[PDB]
């Protein structure tokens, strides 16, 4: 059986098993790919890294608004841009 | 009235047995 290792977690993964790494106050979306070289491929390009959380695509969250006046409601969309859009509550 | 933008965007690929 190919594995990947990850000295962070420091758990074993199997060939396309998905995983959390936190690292760089982050937290990065793996995947084991293996290739016979225990590659790991990391990405943050499906999470939103806003406000210093780390969310997930349809994860909502709160800021105020440039005005002040009232409440954003925001949502990660992801879209491989780390994308997120918000609307006034 | 809203706001939009993109968070940081980065791919690693790391060879644990080279």
Do not use: E, P, T, V
């Given at each position: 059986e190919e594995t990947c290792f990850d000295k962070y977690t420091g758990n074993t993964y199997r060939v396309g098993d998905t995983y959390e790494r936190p690292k760089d106050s982050m937290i990065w979306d793996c995947t084991?790919?293996?290739?016979?070289?225990?590659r790991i491929s990391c990405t943050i390009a499906n999470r939103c890294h806003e406000g210093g959380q780390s969310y997930k695509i349809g994860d909502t969250w709160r800021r105020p608004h440039e005005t002040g006046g009232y409440m954003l409601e925001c949502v990660c969309?992801?879209?491989?841009?780390?994308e997120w859009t918000c609307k006034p509550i | 009235t809203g706001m939009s933008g993109f968070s940081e965007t980065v791919t690693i690929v790391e060879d644990t047995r080279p």
């Open positions: 084991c790919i293996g290739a016979g070289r225990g969309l992801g879209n491989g841009k780390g | -």
